[PDB]
Amino acid sequence: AVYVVGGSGGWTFNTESWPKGKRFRAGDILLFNYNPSMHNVVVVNQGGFSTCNTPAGAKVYTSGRDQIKLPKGQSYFICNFPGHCQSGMKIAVNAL
Ligand SMILES: [Cu+2]
């Protein structure tokens, strides 16, 4: 199944809450919509998610319409533009 992160508002600020009440499965797809001149999608670990620090080698997406397939387990995504992560532009999901 495909989920549009943030619904009609897309990938934006103060969105950490979006995952709340959703049940993800391995193989599900997260679709991220945004203006790439102003935002990105970065795949980090739990640590990076918590401190808003991008680990070395983290994958960065910048298409504006990214389709990310979820592996089994935990996945963490942040926007690493200055101050975005700190403003709630991050999500944590668990895929069963
Ligand atoms: Cu951003």
From Swiss-Prot:
Protein keywords: Copper, Disulfide bond, Electron transport, Metal-binding, Transport
PROSITE patterns: COPPER_BLUE, PHYTOCYANIN
Record-annotated Phytocyanin domain positions: 1-96
Source organism of this protein record: Cucumis sativus
UniProt: Cu cation binding residues: H39, C79, H84, M89
Keyword Chloroplast: no
Pfam family, one: Cu_bind_like
Disulfide bonds: C52-C85
Claim: Metal-binding is one of the keywords in the record: yes
UniProt name for this protein: Basic blue protein
Note: This type 1 copper protein appears to be the same protein in cucumber seedlings, peelings, and several other plant sources.
UniProt GO MF annotations: electron transfer activity; metal ion binding
